[PDB]
Design a protein around this ligand. Structure first.
Ligand SMILES: [Hg+2]
Length: 207
């Protein structure tokens, strides 16, 4: 094959370390660090308004339009040295309103019929996310209960920032990604468990 290598953090301290060493070289304004901190205590509220009005902020309250602009700005400084793999956790409503109450049997195991409906609906296709993408350097335990697990592959030089410390209200080994990002679902298979779906997306960029 003609496949490229991505660094996957196999240990928490190794991630925490590489992580903090990237926080240094960013040099974020005081203004942004509070936009990122407010973003971690409101990630739900903001991304919701972002997926909604499909990227338009010229209707958002003043407070917001500014924060949104500040978050975007911050990414001019937060890129990644080399190719990396990030981990995200999602609930069924992520795949669609139809998988909401169809994806998992009351046994907790994944329904192989709904799984195929999804595999056909997304495999080898590009998805577009309107809000920001919170992720982790590893499959931390704040996912693991979540039925869907995406594994992003981010290319050298792409916007990605280790905001773990910048906000105390940032998840474990948290790594933010720019809004409006577009990735390509390259693989879907069930965990060697029975309950999950292990997606393998390939990021491309943000427009
Ligand atoms: Hg990381």
């Amino acid at each position: 094959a003609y496949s490229n290598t991505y660094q996957e953090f196999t240990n928490i301290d190794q991630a925490k370390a590489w992580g903090n060493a990237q926080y240094k070289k960013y040099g974020l304004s005081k203004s942004e660090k509070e936009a990122i901190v407010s973003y971690t205590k409101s990630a739900s509220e903001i991304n919701g308004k972002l997926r909604q009005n499909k990227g338009v902020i010229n209707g958002f309250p003043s407070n917001l339009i500014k924060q949104v602009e500040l978050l975007d700005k911050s990414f001019n400084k937060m890129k990644t040295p080399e190719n990396i793999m990030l981990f995200r956790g999602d609930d069924p409503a992520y795949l669609g309103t139809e998988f909401q109450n169809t994806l998992l049997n009351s046994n907790g195991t994944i329904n192989k019929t709904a799984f195929e409906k999804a595999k056909a609906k997304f495999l080898n296709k590009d998805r577009l996310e309107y809000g920001y993408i919170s992720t982790s350097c590893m499959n931390v335990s704040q996912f693991a209960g979540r039925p869907i697990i995406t594994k992003f592959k981010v290319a050298k030089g792409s916007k990605a920032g280790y905001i773990d410390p910048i906000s105390a209200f940032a998840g474990q080994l948290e790594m933010l990604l720019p809004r409006h990002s577009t990735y390509h679902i390259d693989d879907m298979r069930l965990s060697s468990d029975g309950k999950q779906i292990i997606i393998t997306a390939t990021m491309m960029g943000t427009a």
